[PDB]
Structures are given as C-alpha cells and as structure tokens.
Design a protein around this ligand. Structure first.
Ligand code: OAA
Lengths: 535, 534
C-alpha cells in the first residue's frame, strides 16, 4: 500500500505504512518500551499482552453520531424522529468534515498501521474494511476481531468502509457544535467511513461495523443478530440473544456444541453465519476451572484489556478495580471446539433470549409462543451490566430492542420481521431464559442455566408438560433434569410470595408501557395479547 | 418405642421406628442410594456427609407462628402487641389443628426416625424433647445439636416437648388463613409441640427449642442467652453475646479457655450451662489455617449443609453462589478443647457484647457502666449476615434486642432483668466489643480483637485508666497490650474527628429512636441517660 493511497482519505505526509502486520510483528511492537500512556503493553504470565484504556472502559453511546444525508435520511432509525429512544444521533455533513479533519490531522505525519479485513463470513454480503491506526495494539484488536483475508484476497482488496482510529485526538469545538463531549464515534454512509476520536475502548472498533451490517443486511432480507451461535453434532444450530454479561459468551462455548461465534451473526438462505474473526470476551471473575476453553485462549496473540496484572506478571481476573468490564480479544481459532473452515452452519432450530432480570420476577426458563417470541424480541427486557457503557456502575434494567438496541441502524420491527420469517421457515422454537436474579436477591446459578440450556438443546422441553405463570402467561416446564424443580417457579425463592406478585405487577406495567410504541400497526397491536396482562 | 406411643401424637399407621439411631447407622442411612431430592446425602473426602436444602438456606422468621391461647396470651411478646418488632406472630388454635394434621398425615404410613434428647445441661431445668422425622439426616442433625441421653436416661425418658419435622408437606390453605406462605414453623405451648412444614433448613430444628427455653427459663429467674461461653484455668467464665457470624464462635476459641458452648446458654444459681450438645458453625470461607479447630471437626458424624461439594468429593468452602450461610453441625466433642463430660461451669464474671458495627462508629472495646450494660443489651445493635434469614444477601445493620431478637418469646426487659441479677451476684463486668468495621471501611482485624479479648479475660481492663468517647460516653482504655494504641479510639480511622461526629450522630439517632419503646417504665426512662446523647 502507497502513501498516496492513504492520501485519498485526507491523511497527509504519511511516513511509513505497516500493512497487514503479522502477529509476530504486533507482539514486538506492543512491548516496545518507548511507548507511553495508553499505548503501553505488558506481558502476562499466560503469554498474552495486556493494555489499558483509561476511563474508556466501555462504549460511549452518547458520543455516537451518523451523518444525515441522502443515503441515510429516509432509511435510518433516527434518535430525533421516532417514538423509541436510540443512539443514532444525526450529524451534519459540515460537522462531519470537522471531525474527519481532526482525525486525519492526528494520523498525519506518522507511522500508521493498516489492517484490511472482512466483516461477514460470506463473500456475497461481507464488507471489506480498511482500518487505520497509529497504535499497534489497536491494529491487533481488529486483526483479532475481523476475518483475516488470504494473500490472494489482499491482492484484490477494495475497501467498502474505512475505519480511522484517532483515539489520541479530541474535538475542542464540541460544545458549540451541540455534541455530547469532546469524544466522538461518527459514521458517514455516503463516504463509507467511521471515525473514532478520544475513546480508547476496543469495542468501538468492532461495534461500528456491526451497526453497518445491521443497516445493510435486513434491507436484503437477511437477519442481523446480536447473539452467540453454536451447533450440535447433528447440525442443529442455536442462537443466544443478549447483552454482554448476560450469558451469551459463556453459554455458547458449551463442550457438547461447536462454536460458530460470540456476538454478531447473520441468517440468510443458507444458515447462520458469523461476522467476526474472533471473540471479545468479558474476563471478570474468569477462572480456568469455570471457563476452560476461554481461559485457554488467553495466550500469545490474545489481547487483554483493563485486567489487573500483579507485579510478578500474573493476572488477577477477579479484580474489577479499573472496571468490571475487563475484556480479552482473541482470534477464533484460539478455541479448538469451533466450526471450520468457515464460521457458519445451517438454519437455527433453537432461539434463546437471555434476560438478566434484576427484579427476580421471570422464570429461569419459559417456552414462548410465536406471538410471545415477537413480543419479547421487540421488548428486549434485560440489564446493562457495570462498565459495559460508560457511567453504568451497577446492573441497570433496560428495554433493549432486539437484545441489541445500541447497535440497531434500522427500526426494531425491521429486525423482527426478518427474524420471524427465518424462524418460521425453520420451525425454530424460542425460549426465554433468566440469567439474572431470583427472589433470594442472588444471581441465578450458571450450573442451573447450563442445565437448562442442555434441556433446551436436546429437544426435551419442546413438548414437555408445563404450568403457566400468571400475568406474564409464560409456560414453565414442570420439571427439568439436573435442576432443583423448586427454582423453576420464580415465586418460590421469595421469603413472602406476595412480594413476587407486587414486583410482577410493577414489571408487567413497565413492559406494557414500553411496548405501546410498537402498537401503531395492526400486527403490532395484535401482539399486546401475548404480553403481560394486569388484572 | 412402640407405634401406639407415636399414634398418641396423631400419627397413623406407623411402620418401622428407628429410635435413637447410632452415628454409624445414620451414616449408613444417609448414603442409601435410593434417596432422592433434599433427602440425598453425599460423602466428602473428609469423611463427613453433606446434604443440600435447596432454597431453604436460612431461617424463615416470616413463617414463625405461636398459638395464642390461655397459656401464652398474657405472657408472650406478640408481634401485634404494639411493643416493638418481633416474629412472634399469633396463631389460632383452629389453624394449629390444621397445620398439625398436615404434618401428622405426612408422617403417617411410613418408617420414622425418633430422637429423644435434652435441651439444657442440668436435669432440673432441661426440656426432654422428642424429635420425629422421616429423613435420616434430620435425625442426625438433632443428634448433633441436642444433648444425647445415656441408656439409663432413655429408660425413663418422658418427653416435655415434641418436635415434628414435616418438611415434605406444605399448607395449601395458607392464603385464606392469613399466613405468609405455604411453609410454617409453628409452636403450641399448651400441647408442648413444634411443627415444621415446607422448610428444610436444619436450624429450624434447633432455634425453635431455643425460643421455648427463652420463654420458660426467664419466668423462673434463669437467664436464657444467645451467646457462646468458655472458662479459664481458675474457673472464671465468660459469655459472648452476638448474632452468628459476628465473632462469638471465633472469639470463644482460645487455648486459655475450654469451650462450654457456641450459641445457647442458661445462667442459674450454680452458673452458666450450654443448652446444646453440638455446634452449627458457619463455614463460608472456612480454612484449616484460619479456623483449625472447626475445620478439624468436619469429619465422620459431622453433617455439612449447603456446602459446595465438587465431583471428586472435595469441598469448596469458599463458594457462596448458592448461599453464604453454609453450615456444618457436629457433636461438641469434635472440638478437643472443651469442658467435659458436661458443658457447664460456674458464674460468668466477664460479659462481652459483640456488635458488628457497619458504620465504623463504635470503639473496638469499651468498659460499660452498669446502666450502659442494660442500655446496650436491650439495644442489641449489630448486623445480620448474608443468608442467615431468607432474603438477606448483605450485611444488614439491625437492633436485635438482647443480641437475639429473633428468638425472644418474652419482652426484652425480662431477659435484661435476669441477666443483671446474675451479673450483680457474680460481680460480673461487661464490655462492648466492635467486631465489625472502622472508619476506613475495612473490618476490624481479628488479631486486634483477639488481643482485646485476652485483655478483658485476665482482668487487666477492669481497673485500667480510660478516656471517654463523646456522645456515647464510652470508657475506652488508654492503652492495651498487643494492639497499637491508635486503634482504641474510633475517630483515628477518620480524616477528621468531625467526620466521625457526622457518622456518630446518625447512628446515635437510630439508637435513640430504637430505645424509645423501652421508656414507659421509670427504669427504662432512666436508662436513656446511659445511651448516646446528641
Ligand atoms: O455486546 C454489548 O452489549 C457490548 C460490547 O460487547 C462491545 O462493547 O463490544
């Protein structure tokens, strides 16, 4: 790649270009002792480099902006146009040029790392993305998280999107421009470019492209899903929707299943496919005994983010002092139990919605009807966990449409429409699984949740006998192998069962009020009957 | 024991009776592979059987009821009497007959375990209790926790109280009967009976008899105390009042002192006596290095409850993901440094109130005046630990009258009256010891607290020079061997003494509001002067 080729993007005076850096090169660069500040890396006992990101320990949804122009005006789900809140705040073309100037100036006159990669496992729908950074570890992050092209694919590489990471710069004019802060994560779908200013959080470099796939794929009838995905020995695929920290990484690395992916998937005529080339796993409280596949992926070429490293070089995975949202990224082949040669398989037969219910009202597991599936997908009731977005310090209940509202570029109903079409063609059954808390105020045990997933995936619940929870009208299995029957009814863990009724009424009303905005069509109005009902 | 004898309690068609089974038989019965559900027992690598009680990981005070009849109407400290918060909820005789029928039908038509035992080490005041269960490990629990009679004592054993464990049954009529849930822990002082319904937590089988002793003993001038107790070489006894998990087990373990007991004691004309035959110890975070004596009691004939047992049979004592209130019970002789063969000694001369102060206000040690002894006994400021009662999941500050409000059948002042009488006759001195937290937000170190107990027990503080903490007016020793003098004043862990005053006045207000219910008598009104003064 030529300096002039990067001059097309507005960068000037490019010194040297480190194109498609190898893992060996990134390792040496990351340990260079001349690095300062948030560029510095340290080597841990496990052989993986660890970095820190300052206060930027989670995403910055309040600094997310999309240029409103002829490409996006009539197609985007805008933060200032709908009944439903979202983070897609409109940006003017003039202000975009100002932000782009800040970033290109910052990346000018410097040695730059350039990573070309794919978002999307399938050539017919993938984005070719060119990432530009001045920091080796940020280049390493995107080499891990996106799909690494072959040499032949590189020779003919034509980028569809450019991502420029200018974490080291900020926008001093932000107040007068009506922006939220001196930081920015900005998208222009006409120039096909993402800018990062101020924030060093690794996730910003992957969830931008997820948002772009969430724009392009549902318009072509392909579902675009915030879920993990795995497959059984017989080719049966399951997808697990949820926010990070609510169980989708942990439940998807099941030893009885083979991993398709961690976080971002599409569903087309052939099946369920991963967008990513790696996994960005939460490491708080990680242990070798509890998560052996993930723990073993932490070795050279993994990249640890905000973990506490002792003076002797060992990692204290239990220490959330910099943040609870500690992370590691690794290329997906650091897990042996994965689908190869491409991260994809056939249609999903099981759809699992993970809800971290902080009210302790919902059952550990419920088998949803078809209408309840749409109702609960649009609702997206769960919790934001500490650190996942800046400013979140404790589990925060939320209605996150499609279990991923922060990444939606289209209206929630457009994701629901495609998901339902694909589920119906497959005969897929959906389940609502509470990975949050119960009446004891304690978190539901991962041992119980894994046993529940086992029972879902082997088909044993599809026709099992059930009872119905009042108010929510959720069908609960009467018994489940490997789990204390008494915990299946969320009422039993209450010292006084009337307290369940009270909290359930409260949560039922939150659901009804949240769902009202989806009832402006006959189809949406008809789903109210599948939601919770007050007496 | 014959079937006819149990049919007198209302049980029908009794098949086999397993009467006072040995420890060896109970081990065989608990490992029967045909057992399902909460009945199942597994063997750990330490040789102790472990059981799991599901969602019943602590006491159920909201399910505790006492029949209100001619025996109890005028004497019990009822929950609806308007004289302070308590769990003594009244039950009608009619609803009692319904609950009893649920349990007796549940126990009918099957093999029963019967354990006869004593509550109280002295024959003159002890209850003879007969426990009936359909689960071997529940019989094991009571074999551990109550006093195991000799063959001669079983010969003419005559029950004073019957405890029926019907954990496997529930009450479907609970809503219309005005009860809290389908579970129940119910007491009838006229029939002299306890019923257990629905809940499998072992401690329900011991704290019910504690509540009965707390009724019967103070009415005849015998103190009934939620405390641990031990005795030195000279015969001097100490009692440590407090809630479980706030130091009474740990601090009574002391090479200079033989253990009398862990949790429940009486104090009569002859001295201090354990009610129990064993210990029900909290095991969260237990380690051999930190609690060697308790750890070494976990072996065959102990009974682990809700501890995590791995697939290889090892125990993960640190895992609180199900509950922090993991427990083990063992007969007391699993501790070597004990008073034997009877768990009793003379009069106490040192009385230690343990307060787990979550606000970092109170001194690690204060020497109380006579009026302060009553004021702080009645206030019972401390904290309830996670899991000890259902629904508690973090340290919870509480005013637990007499350091055991959950078990008081009479008004708090009746326990204070008898305690003061015994202390005064014995020349006893009281100390208030903070086992909780200091200004920094960290917990007071056990090493400091152990040095404090040493200094109390050898009499070195009784005449030592003191200074006075303001507001609470607490006499603090000016120095103390084995602790850095810095720690004795609770202000020193605050940036400024004004920052302490801030916290202190907040807590003092809670003390004053909590004590006001005691001020309708001249004596109670006079005690306000011994409390904190804003
Ligand atoms: O998945 C979410 O909800 C957030 C996240 O991981 C990311 O930041 O990359």
């Amino acid at each position: 790649l030529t300096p002039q080729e990067l001059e097309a993007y507005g960068i000037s005076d490019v010194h040297d270009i480190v194109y498609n850096p190898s893992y060996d090169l990134l390792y040496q660069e990351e340990l260079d002792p001349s690095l300062t500040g948030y560029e510095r890396g340290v080597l841990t006992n496990l052989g993986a480099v660890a970095v820190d990101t300052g206060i930027f320990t989670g995403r910055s949804p309040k600094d997310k902006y999309i240029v409103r122009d002829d490409t996006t005006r009539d197609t985007f789900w805008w933060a200032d146009k709908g009944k439903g809140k979202n983070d897609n705040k409109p940006l003017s073309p003039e202000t975009w040029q100002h932000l782009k100037g800040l970033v290109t100036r910052q990346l000018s006159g410097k040695r730059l790392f350039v990573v070309d990669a794919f978002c999307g496992a399938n050539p017919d729908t993938r984005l070719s993305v060119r990432f530009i950074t001045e920091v080796a570890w940020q280049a390493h992050f995107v080499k891990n998280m996106f799909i690494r092209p072959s040499d032949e694919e590189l020779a003919g590489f034509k980028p569809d999107f450019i991502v420029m990471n200018g974490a080291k710069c900020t926008n001093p004019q932000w107040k007068e421009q009506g922006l939220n802060s001196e930081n920015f994560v900005a998208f222009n779908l006409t120039e096909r470019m993402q800018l990062i200013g101020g924030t060093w959080f690794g996730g910003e470099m992957k969830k931008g492209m997820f948002s772009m796939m969430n724009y392009l794929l549902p318009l072509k009838g392909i579902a675009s899903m915030h879920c993990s995905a795995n497959v059984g020995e017989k080719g049966d695929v399951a997808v697990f929707f949820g926010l990070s920290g609510t169980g989708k990484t942990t439940l998807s690395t099941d030893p009885k299943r083979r991993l398709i992916g961690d976080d971002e998937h599409g569903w087309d005529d052939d099946g369920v496919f991963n967008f990513e080339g790696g996994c960005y796993a939460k490491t708080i409280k990680l242990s070798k005994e509890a998560e052996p596949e993930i723990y073993n992926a932490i070795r050279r070429d993994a990249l640890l983010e905000n973990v506490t490293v002792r003076e002797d070089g060992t990692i204290d995975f239990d220490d959330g002092s910099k943040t609870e949202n500690t992370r590691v990224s690794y290329p997906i082949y650091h897990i042996d139990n994965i689908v190869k040669p491409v991260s994809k398989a056939g249609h999903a037969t099981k759809v699992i919605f993970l809800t971290a219910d902080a009210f302790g009202v919902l059952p550990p597991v419920s088998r949803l009807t078809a209408d309840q599936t749409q109702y609960h997908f649009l609702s997206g009731f769960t919790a934001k966990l500490a650190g996942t977005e800046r400013g979140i310090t404790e589990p925060t209940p939320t209605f996150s449409a499609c279990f991923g509202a922060a990444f939606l570029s289209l209206h929630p109903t457009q994701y629901a429409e495609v998901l339902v079409k694909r589920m119906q063609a497959a005969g897929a059954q959906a389940y609502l699984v509470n990975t949050g808390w119960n009446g004891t105020g304690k978190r539901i045990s991962i041992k119980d949740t894994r046993a529940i997933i086992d029972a879902i995936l082997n088909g044993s619940l599809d026709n099992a006998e059930t009872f119905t929870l009042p108010m929510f009208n959720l069908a609960i299995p009467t018994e489940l192998p490997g789990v204390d029957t008494k915990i299946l009814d969320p009422r039993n863990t209450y010292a006084s069962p009337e307290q369940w009724q009270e909290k359930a009424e409260t949560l039922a009303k939150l659901f009804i009020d949240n769902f009202d905005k989806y009832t402006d069509t006959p189809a949406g109005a008809a789903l109210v009957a599948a939601g919770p009902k007050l007496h």
